[PDB]
Design a protein around this nucleic acid. Structure first.
Ligand SMILES: [Mg+2]
Ligand SMILES: [Mg+2]
Ligand SMILES: [Mg+2]
Ligand SMILES: [Zn+2]
Lengths: 59, 100, 116, 208, 138, 79, 127
RNA sequence: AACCUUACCAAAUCUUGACAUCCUUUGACAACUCUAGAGAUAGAGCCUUCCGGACAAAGUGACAGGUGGUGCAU
RNA sequence: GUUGGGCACUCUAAGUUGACUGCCGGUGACAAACCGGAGGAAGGUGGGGAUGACGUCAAAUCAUCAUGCCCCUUAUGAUUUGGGCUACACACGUGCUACAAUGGACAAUACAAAGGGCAGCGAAACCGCGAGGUCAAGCAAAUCCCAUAAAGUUGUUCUCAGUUCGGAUUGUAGUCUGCAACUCGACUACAUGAAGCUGGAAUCGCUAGUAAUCGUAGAUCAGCAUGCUACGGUGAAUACGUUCC
C-alpha cells in the first residue's frame, strides 16, 4: 500500500505529531537522513554516482 | 580596527585555496591592508550505512562529508577594493559571506 | 524497641532505623535533624531522652502495620474492580508495562520448564 | 564477490562531484531538485546520447552542462530545442537556468553510451555475445587501454540466468589513480530484465 | 620497563602491573606500598629483603607440559617464567588468603613465604611433586 | 494524567454525559475513547467501550475516578 | 634566557621552557605533586636528567593541555628531553641510547563497524 | 511499534477510487466558521474570481491501485 | 589571554620534506632474501583503515526500488477510529546491572577527545529536595550553548554481614513531551528492598595503547537506547613454542 501512504505523508495531517519522514524518491520510512531526506540505499546510489556534494567514502 | 571579514565554506580544498588566492590578490591589487588566509578547523560530518538492502547489519559503509572553512580579512578598506571584491561572483561550489 | 522492633545496637542510629519498614535513609536523616543527635552516634550509647525524642518524632509517620495495611488495601481495591493492574496483581504478573516473555521471574516465581 | 562502484570509490580523488554546489542547510530541497532535473532529461536521454550532466548553482543562476555526442538533436538547429527546454525546465524549478550542451566525440569510448547501445540492441533481440565483442573491438580501435563488459540475466530467452563477461586489456579497479569510467544500464527484454555493466580505462591523468 | 620510585626495583613495578585491575596502577601502588609499610611494622626489617626472600622461596625451578591419553612431562622452567609464576601465585593465593584488606593479605603472604610457609610454597611443592612423579617421561 | 495542568477527557463524551445528566436510568453510552479519564461526573452511567472488536459494558463506581476506560476494556484475550 | 621544547604524547601537548635553577617544576601555574598524584610519573619526568647527571641544574615551567595525567607527563618528559638538546646538543647520543626522544605514536585506535571496539568482536555462538 | 508509522485484526465507510495521463463543463482556487458524527464524513455557509498554459473542482471511459504469489524466471 | 599589545610557542590547514632494504657489516648460489647495526620522530607492507579475483553456497532480498509471468479490481485496492506488532507454561541467542573492601556513602579538588546546534543549542539569576519551571543573554561557530567529563587524587566514615552490598518488584505523589502516555514513553522524590556470596557439562573474545575498565558524543528522534556508530582517559598479562583440537 505504498503510493497511497506516499500521498498520505506528503499531505498535512490532523496534528503535527503524525508527520513522518520517508525518502522522496523511494517511499521508504526507515533509515532516512533528514538532511538529505534520503534513505540509506538511495544515499549510496547517488553518492556513488557522484550526485551528492561533499560526500566521499571515508578513511 | 576598520576591517572587512570574509568567510569561504567549501567542500574542496584545491578549489577554495585558489578562490581565496583570487580574492586576496584582488584586494591587495585594488587596495592594500590585507590579512592572510586563515584556516579554520574544517568540520566533517560522517554518515554510516549498512551495505545491504535487507539485513546484514554487520557490514557498513562510512561516508564523510568534509566542510573546509577559510577566513580572510581586509584591513582598512578603500572603495576600490570593496568594488573589486563584490564584483567577483566566483566560483560555484563555495559559499562566500562578507561581513562589514 | 522503637517501632516494635528492637533494632540493632552495634550499628549507628541511621542504619538501625533503616531496619524499620517505612523508614528509609531520607526519613532517617530528617528525623535525626528533627531530634538533634549526630548520626555518627549509636542506639546503645544514646541518652534515653534523645531516644524518646526520636520515638515522638517517628510516631508522626505511617510505619510497619499501618503501612502494610494501607498498601494492601490500595491493591485489593483495584483487584476487586478488576483493572488491568488489578488483574495482573490477581495473576501474579507484572504491572508496570513490562514484558512477560523471557523475563518476569520475580512476579512469576521460579522456572517451570515445560517440554517442547 | 560483491565489489563496489569505482566512481563511488574515486569521487573526491580523481573525479569530482557532478553536482558542484554548496548549501549549508537546504539540501532538503536542492538535492531533490537536482534529481528531478536528472529525471526530466528523460526527454533528451531517450535518444540524444547524453552521457552525464553536471550542475552548478549560484544565487541568481543555475548553470547546467549536458554532455553528448549527438548535440544537434538537443539544440535543434539554432536553439529551438534548448529554448523548449528552458521553458518547461525553468517552469518546474522556478529559477533562472542557463544550460550548456557540450560535446564528447568518440562516442564508442564512453561507458554509458556503450551501455545504452547494447541495451537497445538487446531489446532489438540481437546476441549478447556479438554485441560485447564488437563493442570492445571498436573501443580498442579507438585506442583504450582496457575495456570490460558484462551482461546478466535471461540470455537467449533461457529459462534461468547467466552472467557473461568479456575483456581485452587492463582494468585495474584497485588502482585509484585510474580513471575507469563505469556504467550500468538495463534492458526490458520480452523475457525479463538484462543488466549490463561496462567499464573503460582510457589512460591515466589527474584533475589537479 | 623501569624500576619503582621509592625502592628502585623492577620486580615491584612488575608486580604492581599484575595486581592492577582495569589499569588502576595507583590503587595497586597504594596497597603494595602500605603492605611494605606493614611488613616493616611486623617482622621489622627491609620490605625488599623479605620480599625477595619470599619470591626466592616460592618461585619454582620445574614445570610440566601436558601432551600425548595425556602424559604430563617435566621441563626446566625458564628464568622469566620463574618470576612470572612467583608473582602470580603470590597475588592469587593472597587474594584467597581471605581477610579484610589486600595489604594485610599480601603482607601475610610475603611473610609466610619468607618463612617458607604459605599457599604459594604449597603450589611450588605440588608442582615439583607432580614433576618428579612424572620424571619417568622426561 | 501524568502532569498537573488539567485532566483529559474527550469532548464528544463529556458533552453526552452532561446531556445524560437527567438520569433516565435506561441509558448506556458508547465510545471508542479508551483514552478518557473518569471524572466524578460519570458515576452510575454505564459505558460501552470499544475493546478492538466489541463494545463491552462497564458500570462506573466511586473507585474508578482516577482511572481510564481502557483499564476496564480488556484487549488481549489470554487464558 | 630559556631552552624550549614541545612534547606531545597521546593527545596531550606540553610546552616546556627549561631555565637554570634549583629543581622546581611548575605545570599550568601549579606544582608537580600538587597536580599529578603518582610518583613514577615524576620518575619518568626526571629520567632525561638522570641520563645526563643534570638533575638539579634546571627548573622547569610547562604549559600543558590535552588528555590525562600519564601521557600528559610523558609529554612533559619528551619536551624536556628535546629542550635539553637545544641547551646541549651532545646529549643526543645518550637520549638515543636510552630511547627518550621517540614520540610514542601509540595512539588510541579507531572503533570499527561490526565490532564492539577496535579489536573485540561480539560473543559468537554457532547455535 | 502510544496515535500515524502499520503492512495485520474488528467495526464503520468509498468504489475512475488515497495517487497519475487524457477529453470536455469549466474555472482562477479556497481559507476559516457552525450542526451531527468516534472519525473519516456529509450538511449550512463564508463570497471564492480567466492571474491559454496555470490553480480549482465536476461527468467520463480508457484507467489507476495492489507491503498480493513466485528471490527456483530476474 | 580578558584587554592593550606580539603571532614567538601550541593549534588550525593548504603546500612540501620524510622511509625507500636508502646506507654499514655478516650470512646466503655471488642473486633474491635474512640477521644485526648506524642514522633518524619512525625501519623493514611503521600502526590502523578504505579497496574484496574467477567463482561456491539455485545463500538473502519481488517489503528500498525496477521488472517478466500469475492473481484481486464494487476488492487481495482505498479512508477513519480503536486494538495488536509490547501476549506468556516454557527453551535459545546478544547485552546491561550485580553478587562488594582493589569496595559503598559523603565532602573538597584535577586532566580530555570527537561531535551537534534555527526555529534549534538554551549560559546566568531565581523557584523547586529532584525530575524540571519562569524570565532571558549569546549563538548559524575555533566566539555562545550543549558541556561539571567519569574513573583518579585527598580526607572521614561503614568493618565482612544477604550487609549502609545489589536495586528488581510494588504503592503513593509528581515533572517533560505530545491531541493523548490503561493496553504502551522516559524521568524524579518517598516508601518497599526480591533474586544474587562470582556460576555444571560446555564455551567466547583478545597479541598493545590492544584486552580490561570509566565517561562522553551523535544519526533515527516531538518524546523514548542496557542497542548501533564514533571519541578520548587509565592500562595490562603472556607468547616457551608447534606434540595435540
Ligand atoms: Mg490506524
Ligand atoms: Mg591492496
Ligand atoms: Mg534459496
Ligand atoms: Zn530513499
Amino acid at each position: 500500500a505504498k503510493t497511497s501512504m506516499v500521498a498520505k505523508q506528503q499531505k498535512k495531517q490532523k496534528y503535527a505529531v503524525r508527520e513522518y519522514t520517508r525518502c522522496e524518491r523511494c517511499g521508504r520510512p526507515h533509515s532516512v537522513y533528514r538532511k538529505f531526506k534520503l534513505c540509506r540505499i538511495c544515499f549510496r546510489e547517488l553518492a556513488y554516482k557522484g550526485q551528492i556534494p561533499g560526500v566521499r567514502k571515508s578513511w | 580596527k576598520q576591517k572587512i571579514r570574509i568567510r569561504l565554506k567549501a567542500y574542496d580544498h584545491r578549489v577554495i585555496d585558489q578562490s581565496a588566492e583570487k580574492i586576496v590578490e584582488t584586494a591587495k591589487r585594488s587596495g592594500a591592508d590585507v590579512s592572510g588566509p586563515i584556516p579554520l578547523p574544517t568540520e566533517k560530518s560522517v554518515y554510516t550505512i549498512i551495505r545491504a538492502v535487507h539485513k546484514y547489519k554487520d557490514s557498513r559503509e562510512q561516508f564523510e562529508q568534509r566542510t573546509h572553512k577559510r577566513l580572510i580579512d581586509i584591513v582598512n578598506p578603500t572603495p576600490k577594493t570593496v568594488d573589486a571584491l563584490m564584483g567577483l561572483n566566483l566560483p560555484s561550489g563555495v559559499d562566500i559571506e562578507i561581513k562589514l | 524497641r522503637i517501632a516494635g522492633v528492637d533494632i540493632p545496637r552495634e550499628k549507628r542510629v541511621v542504619i538501625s532505623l533503616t531496619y524499620i519498614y517505612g523508614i528509609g535513609t531520607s526519613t532517617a536523616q530528617k528525623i535525626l535533624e528533627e531530634a538533634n543527635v549526630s548520626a555518627d552516634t549509636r542506639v546503645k550509647d544514646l541518652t534515653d531522652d534523645e531516644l524518646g525524642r526520636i520515638r515522638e518524632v517517628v510516631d508522626g509517620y505511617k510505619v510497619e502495620g499501618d503501612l502494610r495495611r494501607e498498601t494492601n488495601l490500595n491493591i485489593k481495591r483495584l483487584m476487586e474492580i478488576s483493572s488491568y493492574r488489578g488483574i495482573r496483581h490477581r495473576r501474579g504478573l507484572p504491572v508496570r508495562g513490562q514484558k512477560t516473555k523471557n523475563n518476569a521471574r520475580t512476579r512469576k516465581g521460579p522456572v517451570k520448564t515445560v517440554a517442547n | 564477490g560483491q565489489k563496489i562502484n569505482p566512481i563511488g570509490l574515486r569521487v573526491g580523488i580523481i573525479r569530482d562531484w557532478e553536482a558542484k554546489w554548496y548549501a549549508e542547510k537546504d539540501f532538503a530541497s536542492l538535492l531533490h531538485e537536482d534529481l528531478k532535473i536528472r529525471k526530466f532529461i528523460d526527454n533528451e536521454l531517450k535518444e540524444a546520447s547524453v552521457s552525464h550532466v553536471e550542475i552548478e548553482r549560484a544565487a541568481n543562476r543555475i548553470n547546467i552542462a549536458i554532455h553528448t555526442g549527438k548535440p544537434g538533436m538537443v539544440i535543434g538547429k539554432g536553439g529551438s530545442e534548448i529554448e523548449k527546454l528552458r521553458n518547461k525546465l525553468n517552469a518546474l524549478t522556478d529559477k533562472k537556468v542557463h544550460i550548456n550542451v557540450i560535446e564528447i566525440k568518440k562516442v564508442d569510448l564512453d561507458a554509458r553510451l556503450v551501455a545504452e547501445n547494447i541495451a537497445r540492441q538487446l531489446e532489438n533481440r540481437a546476441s549478447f555475445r556479438r554485441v560485447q565483442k564488437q563493442a570492445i573491438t571498436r573501443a580498442m580501435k579507438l585506442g583504450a587501454k582496457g575495456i570490460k563488459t558484462q551482461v546478466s540475466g535471461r540470455l537467449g530467452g533461457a529459462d534461468i540466468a547467466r552472467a557473461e563477461q568479456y575483456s581485452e586489456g587492463t582494468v585495474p579497479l584497485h588502482t585509484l589513480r585510474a580513471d575507469i569510467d563505469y556504467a550500468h544500464a538495463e534492458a526490458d527484454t520480452t523475457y525479463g530484465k538484462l543488466g549490463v555493466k561496462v567499464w573503460i580505462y582510457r589512460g591515466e591523468v589527474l584533475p589537479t | 620497563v623501569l624500576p619503582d620510585p621509592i625502592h628502585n626495583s623492577k620486580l615491584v613495578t612488575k608486580l604492581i602491573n599484575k595486581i592492577m585491575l582495569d589499569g588502576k596502577r595507583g590503587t595497586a601502588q597504594r596497597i603494595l606500598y602500605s603492605a611494605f609499610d606493614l611488613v616493616e611494622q611486623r617482622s621489622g626489617r627491609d620490605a625488599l629483603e623479605v620480599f625477595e626472600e619470599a619470591i626466592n622461596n616460592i618461585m619454582p625451578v620445574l614445570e610440566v607440559k601436558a601432551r600425548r591419553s595425556n602424559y604430563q612431562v617435566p621441563v626446566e622452567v625458564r628464568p622469566e617464567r620463574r618470576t612470572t609464576l612467583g608473582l602470580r601465585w603470590l597475588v592469587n593465593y593472597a587474594r584467597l588468603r581471605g581477610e579484610k584488606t589486600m595489604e594485610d593479605r599480601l603482607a601475610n603472604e610475603i611473610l609466610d613465604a619468607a618463612n617458607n610457609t604459605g599457599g604459594a610454597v604449597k603450589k611450588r611443592e605440588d608442582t615439583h611433586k607432580m614433576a618428579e612423579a612424572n620424571k619417568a617421561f622426561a | 494524567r501524568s502532569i498537573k495542568k488539567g485532566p483529559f477527557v474527550d469532548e464528544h463524551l463529556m458533552k453526552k454525559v452532561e446531556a445524560q445528566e437527567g438520569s433516565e436510568k435506561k441509558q448506556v453510552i458508547k465510545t471508542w475513547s479508551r483514552r478518557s479519564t473518569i471524572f466524578p461526573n460519570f458515576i452510575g452511567h454505564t459505558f460501552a467501550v470499544y475493546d478492538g472488536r466489541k463494545h463491552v459494558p462497564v458500570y462506573v463506581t466511586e473507585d474508578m475516578v482516577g482511572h481510564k476506560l481502557g483499564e476496564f476494556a480488556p484487549t488481549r484475550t489470554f487464558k | 634566557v630559556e631552552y624550549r621544547g614541545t612534547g606531545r604524547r597521546k593527545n596531550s601537548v606540553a610546552r616546556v621552557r627549561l631555565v637554570p635553577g634549583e629543581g622546581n617544576i611548575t605545570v599550568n601555574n601549579r606544582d608537580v605533586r600538587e597536580y599529578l598524584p603518582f610518583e613514577s610519573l615524576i620518575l619518568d619526568l626526571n629520567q632525561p636528567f638522570d641520563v645526563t647527571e643534570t638533575k638539579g641544574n634546571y627548573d622547569v615551567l610547562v604549559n600543558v593541555h590535552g588528555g590525562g595525567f600519564t601521557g600528559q607527563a610523558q609529554a612533559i618528559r619528551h619536551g624536556i628531553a628535546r629542550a635539553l638538546l637545544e641547551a646541549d646538543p651532545e646529549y643526543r647520543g645518550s637520549l638515543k641510547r636510552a630511547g627518550l626522544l621517540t614520540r610514542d605514536p601509540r595512539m588510541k585506535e579507531r572503533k570499527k563497524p561490526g565490532l564492539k571496539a577496535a579489536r573485540r568482536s561480539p560473543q559468537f555462538s554457532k547455535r
